[PDB]
Paper text:
V1 is a part of an ion pump V-[name], which transports cations across the membrane by ATP-hydrolysis-driven rotation. V1 comprises a rotor composed of the D and F subunits, and a stator, a hexameric ring, composed of three A subunits and three B subunits. However, the details of their sequences and structures are different, resulting in two different interfaces between the A and B subunits in the A3B3 hexameric ring: a catalytic interface, at which the A subunit has an ATP-hydrolysis catalytic site; and a non-catalytic interface, at which the B subunit has a pseudo-active site, which has evolutionally lost the ATP-hydrolysis or even binding ability. We used computational design to restore the lost ATP-binding ability of the pseudo-active site in the B subunit of a rotary molecular motor, V1-[name].
To provide a structure-based interpretation of the allosteric effect, two additional crystal structures were solved. The nucleotide-free crystals were incubated overnight by gradually increasing the ADP concentration to 5 mM, and two different structural states in an asymmetric unit were obtained from one dataset at 4.2 Å resolution. Comparison of the two structures indicates that a nucleotide binding to the designed site induces the movement of the C-terminal α-helical domains of the designed B subunit and neighbour A subunit, which changes the conformation of the neighbouring catalytic interface from closed to open-like. The conformational change expands the space around the catalytic site formed between the α/β domains of the designed B subunit and neighbour A subunit. This probably weakens the interactions of the catalytic site with ADP. The conformational change suggests a structural mechanism for the facilitation of ADP release at the catalytic sites upon the ATP binding to the designed sites, although the structures are bound with ADP not ATP and do not contain the rotor subunits. The solved crystal structures suggest that the allosteric effect occurs upon the transition of the nucleotide occupation number for the designed sites from one to two. It should be noted, in particular, that the three designed nucleotide-binding sites have different binding affinities because not all of them were occupied by nucleotide in the solved crystal structures.
Author numbering:
A (entry chain F): 3 to 338, 340 to 356, 366 to 454
B (entry chain C): 2 to 586
C (entry chain D): 3 to 386, 393 to 452
């Protein structure tokens, strides 16, 4: 019907009077006096009054001559099989200037809660194509495995390399990747877009771009939009979806900005008190469903604020996520993806697939333990004989973990290569026995 | 009477024309009919906190009150069921809604009202009964005997009662009360905010056999006591609660998960119905009531979870059984309270939490305990409260942990540094404590007729002296201090790796019976004691234990000895003796 | 006289409209629609509007059919000589399921402040039964001596030990004890009640029990009720009353909860600004009165936090109380029972407490010297290695702590045995370095 009764405008908030039939989180469009159209969302409604927040901004709005249309539905996304191979913005509008796809149906981006009985335990394996992940911190279809990275470290390129080299080693080939950029620079956005179009991975991926200069409301809506598309492709058609998100820290900063603009009661460190629940709303959307073929896997990538007190975002993310991946600038300087595998740990690797793993872990850790003290630890008698393990560990960093961002080491590649390194140490020496596993020494 | 919404703002919805409703009444809000709880009321207008999501609800939509407080249905059909915070069956929900997701605005009865159960009357017609007396029983499972007892507040004389096949809605007994004639069903409704009344509370002095060595030996918990388990990131608190859920001498187990991982909850739903009773009875799920709430669930439903669970625990405790309730996690529950108190503009106390946090936690933990159930039967029941705490970064100074420890007596504090190793128990022996050590020492000493209290005090003293030795070790070495203290370090290592270290998801290490505990502790302690008697009596400075390397492996195997072969560890101890007495000369 | 006009109900608060003659802190009764009766208190009154807070709660209240009665008096307590040997709750309701005692009169629990000229200086001695108290930090009839400790240290047992072994060396008047539990668990409740009924001390004591699950309003009213009963029994019946309160930190926490429910302006550390005065109005209820036989002695017992700067509760309590008693969990681990660390513990009124006639002629000489003796002894072995000129003092410190391990909480060391052990263990290496006026006091 379209009311033309704007009563109050305070910053990004606007109050429309003499309304009827307005609902919570309802979308609105502002027809300005100059013809510009701006989207917004209902934050509160009371009788003939309705408070809303405009996404783009509030500059240049004339309260007398402008009008507000009430759409009558919350944040929605139009889903369709033609969604593969396209790039969208945070709200879902096309960005690649391609053909306008006809949506099969519109779904609320908030999704619905999964019944604990209907949820299935993740038991399959994703070949990420990267050595450390595939043989040390294995990813499981349905597991939320985060990636920690120093500012400007290998976390920004690890996203692209995983998003391209991910594939399924199984008869079912319903694979699909959903990449979501959250508050990044245009150079990083073009990094991802150009790499996707160059390697051809964009043909099998759905990208949701949200620049850092974009509004904080769109930054909040971006990951939920990506997960909505992922759930459609996975639980309605039969597709194993791998969601990658970067960056998460910016999502939380924008959420702080949101609650600061809404004058809500702030919790600790200026963040909203419901930040934990709002992150849960996004992390629990992954997994499998009993009776359905598809699955939703999530890889959130965040910049760690560590070496300081644990911020609520790495704390709560690493608590709700089953495992974590740690990267270090000490390895990034040595030309290593620079995945530090000593603190990295996956808590679902048991179902994802151990003999070679439990052996390699203590092996490279023994090379680090021989370097635990000052220089090479550390007793004159140990000398070269102890240096055997550390020679192996130097090679472990130089050729096993350091493979490159364009090298797709499949499960075969990584598994077979891993056995080659152990050739540095003697052959029947896995802790701990005389001949605990003679077979397949290599 | 029907209401009309006038304001919607997040979880808070105000509705006018609600004069016939009352405070804390549950209502269906909006056209969808979402569940909400009345908190405030200004004249006719009432402020309701909606449990489910409120997206798509606006003014003018009607609101209808149920006329009762938070409902829990207590009757046959409650075991082997998975509920939410509001006691709604998830399997029936999936089968009725025909959707793998939980739809907004769907209300279903908790128990199967249409299912037939065999009722057996155990009382004669004409016997006067008060509130709490038992009039019949139903064999809900092959292990648990669901006793149909009188609802609270009903006192009278039995008119007629007879055994037969009836539903939970069919009347099975008539009672002549002072107000008139009243029919009693097999299911009673109770509010979860108010605790079930009892006759008299008593001290919980009966220790519980949890099957965990580190738990049942040094920091034990009694049937009715309270234990808090605060752990860093993934030290193992949830698996500790799992262990207490599977291996415990309690009759029933109520596992409430509030705000935890959905996959971690599905793990429970998967592994519980495939584990059998320790004595080879029935399935674990056939003696456990599960109340699941994902981290992503409605914040209010997460707030009501522990109350529903403790109310079910009180219902089965009123029958005379031993119930163990496991909460995972009370920190997420307290964060739900923080969210509600912050959106209600209440005065923050510490770190944004409401100031009445300590009071609410006291109200919860005081409901659990060994009490005498109401009724002339004078039966005795207990509720052992085990709760898991999730402190930010593992800071114990967090108000949740502090307020919980102010009312509980058992503290199993987990350590990050100990979680890094294989010691996933990670219960820091120096930091942790148990005020039941005295009472449990007395009981465990008397029923076994062994000097168990002295054994425990000596082992704990060895661990404390090891905490001091851990400082005296740096930069001076093993050869520096006396060989006596070197042996002390080796004995502390023996306890830490053979007695304290216990894998939970193991074939035989997951359970350590009381006899096995005493025998394993005897092997370790007598090893240390024979070495203590020998060392100051002419032990070489480099020859102390070289001849015992073949017998210490037996200690390491003691944790893998099956419980069916009980008398193996006794053969270990004597060989220890014979070896160590002759190696010296 | 009943008002059936409830206007709004917000959480634990309720507004009653169309009232007249309502006063501040007036208690009220709510007749609910189902017949349940709930008590409450007036927090504010604006014209005919009156804001009140319900004690039990606000659950299941329909505003239309409920009514409110205004009783017309603040929080009262019915006092009577039959009060000895009974157990009450925070508000005064019986918990021992005994006969309803007929009250002599009702008194406002807030009491009245004592005129500074009417207060009397404490001069008598209480035999607490602990040597570490009766000889080093002497308790005086009318002195407020607190007990500080870490959470879960040697305080719950010390409370019972003092409450039983406390007596005077007289029969006129007969000694009385008032024990108040504030915000404790049921197991601690039963600990105190069972110990009292076991040792027979309940026959000469009055107990005011307030569990931790009890409402915060009752938790606030508990200590004030206990002190009102103590003042009655002391200043009106001439009984020397010893009040023991535990725990006071829970009182402070519940007071924070109260002010958070009343939407008052929070002061420092989240606590109300009037906390200092509200604690003073409870500590200054002790002492003697010129012209009255009885006396009120107070022993508040509190948990001290660690590494949290200095909490205003310990600071203000130790400043308004004449002295303090410090104890440590390190001592509880060492087996000390009762674990009393006498180096930081100090009693400000021990000078008047002891003397010739009051305790003994030599007690004043032994106290001043035991201070320096244990100081030098402990600082000899661990200042703030091997040596001998102070090793002889070191062994003294070690045995001073070890002989207090083997005494336990069930040792009733009288003043005679206390002074006897004092001089009997003072003389191993007699030296003139000890500052005694003459050698006749060196007979031991
Ligand atoms: N007793 C135990 N023995 C071996 N591993 C354990 C034990 N307890 C916990 N774990 C390990 O801890 C992990 C789960 O931790 P969890 O119980 O969820 O604690 P949190 O709630 O702190 O994450 C699992 O990977 C499991 O292998
Ligand atoms: N080491 C401890 N750390 C933290 N809390 C404790 C400890 N020991 C006991 N508590 C808890 O502190 C609460 C109050 O104890 P408190 O009255 O201080 O005991 P005590 O008088 O023996 O010191 C008790 O409910 C108990 O559960
Ligand atoms: Mg957990
Ligand atoms: Mg106590």
């Amino acid at each position: 019907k379209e009311y033309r009764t704007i009563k109050e405008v305070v910053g990004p908030l606007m109050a429309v009077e003499k309304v009827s039939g307005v609902k919570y989180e309802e979308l609105i469009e502002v027809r300005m006096q100059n013809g510009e159209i701006r989207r917004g969302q209902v934050l509160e409604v009371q009788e003939d009054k309705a408070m809303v927040q405009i996404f783009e901004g509030t500059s240049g709005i004339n309260l007398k001559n402008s009008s507000v249309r009430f759409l009558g539905h919350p944040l929605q996304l139009g889903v369709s099989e033609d969604m593969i191979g396209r790039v969208f913005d945070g709200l879902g509008r096309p960005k690649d200037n391609g053909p306008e796809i006809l949506p099969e149906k519109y779904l609320d981006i908030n999704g619905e809660v999964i019944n604990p009985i209907a949820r299935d335990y993740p038991d399959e394996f994703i070949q990420t194509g990267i050595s450390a992940i595939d043989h040390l911190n294995t990813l499981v279809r349905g597991q939320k495995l985060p990636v920690f990275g120093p500012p400007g470290a290998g976390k920004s390129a690890l996203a692209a390399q995983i998003a391209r080299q991910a594939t399924v080693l199984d008869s079912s080939d319903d694979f699909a990747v959903v990449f979501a950029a959250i508050g990044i620079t245009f150079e990083e956005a073009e990094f991802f877009m150009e790499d996707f179009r160059q390697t051809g991975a964009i043909d099998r991926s759905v990208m949701f771009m949200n620049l850092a200069n974009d509004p904080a409301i769109e930054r909040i809506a971006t990951p939920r939009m990506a997960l909505t598309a992922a759930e459609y492709l996975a639980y309605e058609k039969g597709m194993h979806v791998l969601v990658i998100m970067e960056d998460m820290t910016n999502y939380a900063e924008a959420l702080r900005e949101i609650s600061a603009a809404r004058r809500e009661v702030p919790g600790r460190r200026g963040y909203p008190g419901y930040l934990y629940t709002n992150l849960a709303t996004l992390f629990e959307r992954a997994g499998r469903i009993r009776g359905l073929k598809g699955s939703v896997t999530q890889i959130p990538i965040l910049t760690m604020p560590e070496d300081d007190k644990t911020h609520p975002i790495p704390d709560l993310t690493g608590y709700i996520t089953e495992g974590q991946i740690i990267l270090t600038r000490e390895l990034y300087k040595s030309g290593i993806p620079p995945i530090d595998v000593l603190p990295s740990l996956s808590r679902l690797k048991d179902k994802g697939t151990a003999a070679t793993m439990n052996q390699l872990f203590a092996a490279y850790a023994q090379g680090k333990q021989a370097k635990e003290l000052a220089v090479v630890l550390g007793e004159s008698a140990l000398s070269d004989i102890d240096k055997i393990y550390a020679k192996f560990a130097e090679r472990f960093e130089n050729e096993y973990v350091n493979q490159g961002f364009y090298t797709n080491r499949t499960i075969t590649e990584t598994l077979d290569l891993g056995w080659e390194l152990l050739a540095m140490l003697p052959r029947t020496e896995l802790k701990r026995i005389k001949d605990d596993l003679l077979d397949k020494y290599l | 009477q029907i209401g009309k919404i006038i304001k919607v703002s997040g979880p808070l919805v105000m509705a006018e024309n609600m004069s016939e409703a009352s405070i804390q009444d549950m209502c269906l809000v909006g056209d969808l009919g979402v569940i909400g709880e009345i908190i405030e009321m200004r004249q006719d207008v009432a402020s309701i906190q909606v449990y489910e999501e409120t997206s798509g609800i606006g003014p003018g939509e009607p609101v209808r009150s149920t006329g009762e407080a938070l409902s829990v249905e207590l009757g046959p059909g409650i075991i082997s069921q998975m509920f939410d915070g509001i006691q709604r069956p998830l399997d029936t929900f999936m089968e009725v809604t025909q959707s793998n997701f939980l739809g907004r605005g769907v209300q279903l009865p908790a128990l199967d009202h249409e299912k037939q159960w065999w009722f057996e009357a155990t009382i004669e017609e004409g016997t006067e009964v008060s509130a709490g007396d038992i009039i019949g029983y139903v064999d809900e499972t092959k292990i648990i005997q669901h006793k149909i007892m009188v609802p609270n507040g009903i006192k009278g004389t039995v008119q007629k009662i007879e055994s037969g096949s009836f539903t939970i809605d069919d009347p099975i007994c008539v009672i002549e009360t002072e107000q008139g004639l009243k029919e009693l069903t097999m299911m009673q409704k109770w509010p979860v905010r108010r605790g079930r009344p009892i006759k008299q509370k008593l001290n919980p002095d009966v220790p519980m056999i949890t099957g965990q060595r580190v738990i049942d030996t040094f920091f034990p918990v009694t049937k009715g006591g309270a234990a808090a388990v605060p752990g860093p990131f993934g030290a193992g608190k949830t698996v500790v609660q799992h262990q207490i859920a599977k291996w415990s001498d309690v009759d029933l187990v109520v596992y409430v998960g509030c705000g935890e991982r959905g996959n971690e909850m599905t793990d429970v739903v998967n592994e519980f119905p495939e584990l059998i009773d320790p004595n080879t009875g029935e399935s674990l799920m056939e003696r456990t009531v599960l109340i699941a709430n994902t981290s992503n669930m409605p914040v209010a439903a997460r707030e009501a979870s522990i109350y529903t669970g403790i109310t079910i625990a009180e219902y089965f405790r009123d029958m005379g059984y031993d119930v163990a309730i496991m909460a995972d996690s009370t920190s997420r529950w307290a964060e739900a309270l923080r969210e509600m108190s912050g959106r209600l503009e209440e005065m923050p106390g510490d770190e944004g939490y409401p100031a009445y946090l300590g009071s609410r936690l006291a109200e919860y933990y005081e409901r659990s305990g060994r009490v005498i159930a109401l009724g002339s039967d004078q039966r005795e029941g207990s509720i052992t409260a085990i709760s898991a705490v999730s402190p930010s970064g593992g800071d114990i100074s967090e108000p949740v942990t502090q307020n919980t420890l102010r009312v509980v007596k058992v503290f199993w504090g987990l350590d990050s540094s100990l979680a890094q190793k294989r010691h996933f128990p990670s219960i820091n022996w120096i930091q942790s404590y148990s005020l039941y050590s005295t009472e449990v020492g007395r009981y465990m000493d008397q029923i076994l007729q062994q000097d168990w209290s002295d054994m425990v005090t000596e082992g704990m003293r060895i661990l404390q002296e090891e905490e001091q030795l851990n400082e005296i070790v740096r930069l001076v070495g093993i050869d520096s201090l006396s060989d006596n203290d070197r042996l002390t370090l080796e004995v502390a290592k023996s306890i830490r790796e053979d007695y304290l270290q216990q894998n939970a998801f193991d074939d035989v290490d997951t359970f350590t019976s009381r006899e096995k505990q005493f025998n394993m502790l005897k092997v370790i302690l007598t090893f240390g004691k024979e070495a203590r008697k020998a060392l100051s009596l002419g032990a070489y400075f480099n020859e102390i234990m070289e001849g015992t390397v073949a017998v210490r492996e037996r200690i390491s195997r003691s944790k893998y000895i099956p419980e069916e072969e009980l008398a193996k560890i006794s053969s270990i101890n004597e060989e220890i003796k014979e070896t160590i007495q002759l190696i010296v000369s």
